[PDB]
Symmetry: C2
Subunit: 222 residues, 2 copies
């Protein structure tokens, strides 16, 4: 197993950290301030989740990234650059950075829109801000539940995408995705293909409304 | 059998016009200038005689006589094509919008304009407020719009976006007649944003898979 740092204490971070730990990886979870995160009483609260996953350990973004071989970005999209900067470019250099964030924009009305979008992407922004990291955009196109148990929606009949400049990095991420139950991994190409992957979110949001559930997924039929 | 006007002489317009004529509809195909179009270089002049029931005429002349109108024009020019068709000829009728507002001004692959906070489907609806705009079929290759069974046995999804639920219901019936068994109503015309925004990944999937013979399926 690998030493994996999951930056994010929300549903995605918890879901991924728990699943990766169950697969035999040594998993740490990154947060801005561990004391503040553990002190949160409002919901569930992170302090109620952590005791159920005894093999997972909490620390600040910089501390978890420095100790990990591979890093997973599961932070709020609008804050991902800030989170990763706090993690430290020096702690990301030469390592695979799995980017699951969506750059949702909740500033000017509902449902959210994307920023950046179309001619740019959060995946690209992360890669050019941290040029020595090996960014792989993946898993952002489905509900957290399906990232680790895709079988819950239509017997696991679905597609997952990878985007990234380093083919060897994408191959390693594909192996991890397969270990999580994803049998159809499609390589969209370089990191600029994160634009199309991120741009699936607007229809995802409308499908959630139209279908009355987040238990659905995209399948590329061919 | 409805009177359908298909605005567009490219692969989408030809494919849709031919399929609808084969289904029993009285189909007309719209172009800017019939004389100029037939004078080109397969060429439209060779396609047209193979579909004798389909009639070619100017945009304004096909829309006036039609009961339902299909937009199959270049996305960047759709507002101009429909303006030429005439707002008076679109009033009270279903306007099926298949166009994608691809933007080729800054190289390849194309991006979208409008995008994100706006869509071509919305632009069309607010420019022609009395038309009943329904965004659909823009998310797949022309071949699959009329014969979806060609890709993975037809296991795919098609979307409808539009403000008028009765208009969407009529379009859903037409889509079913074309072989689309899974029609998903995304909601109002602003949901055309998500439908149009599937194109960037579509373009990369075409490159990644080496074929246009694929489709989106929403598994649930
Ligand atoms: N919800 C889903 O099922 C789903 C599906 C696909 C993709 N995504 C994407 O996955 C990401 C995570 O979503 P989520 O719902 O689990 O959590 P989230 O609420 O979007 O993000 C919470 C995390 O972001 C960090 N964060 C928030 N503001 C920050 C800032 N100012 N500076 C640095 N870090 C900040 C938090 O740090 P602290 O720990 O210190 O609070 C926390 O770790 C998002 O980008 C989302 O769009 C979510
Ligand atoms: N290719 C596909 O399988 C596919 C799939 C899904 C959606 N779409 C969308 O479907 C639409 C049609 O695509 P296409 O490849 O069949 O044809 P296209 O090349 O995009 O469009 C050709 C049509 O647009 C009209 N047009 C071009 N410039 C115009 C202008 N300045 N003013 C008025 N009309 C103008 C042409 O008029 P004339 O007849 O006078 O030349 C012609 O009828 C596009 O929006 C495209 O994005 C295509
Ligand atoms: Cl554990």
């Amino acid at each position: 197993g690998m030493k994996i740092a999951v930056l994010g204490t929300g549903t995605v971070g918890r879901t991924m950290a728990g699943a990766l730990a169950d697969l035999g990886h040594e998993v740490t979870i990154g947060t801005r301030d561990p004391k503040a995160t553990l002190a949160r009483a409002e919901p569930p609260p992170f302090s109620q989740w952590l005791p159920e996953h005894p093999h997972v350990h909490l620390a600040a973004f910089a501390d978890v990234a420095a100790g990990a071989e591979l890093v997973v970005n599961a932070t709020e999209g609008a804050s991902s650059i800030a989170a990763l900067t706090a993690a430290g470019a020096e702690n990301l250099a030469g390592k695979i950075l799995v980017d699951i964030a969506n750059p949702l924009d909740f500033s000017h009305g509902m449902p959210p829109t994307l920023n950046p979008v179309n001619t740019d992407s959060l995946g690209e922004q992360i890669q050019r801000t941290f040029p020595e990291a090996k960014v792989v955009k993946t898993l952002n196109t489905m509900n957290a539940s399906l990232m680790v148990d895709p079988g819950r929606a239509a017997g696991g009949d679905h597609s997952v995408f990878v985007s990234g400049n380093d083919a060897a990095a994408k191959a390693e991420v594909a192996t991890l995705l397969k270990s999580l139950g994803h049998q159809d991994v499609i390589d969209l190409g370089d990191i600029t293909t994160a634009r199309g992957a991120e741009m699936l979110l607007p229809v995802w949001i409308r499908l959630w409304g139209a279908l009355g559930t987040a238990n659905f997924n995209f399948k590329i039929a061919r």
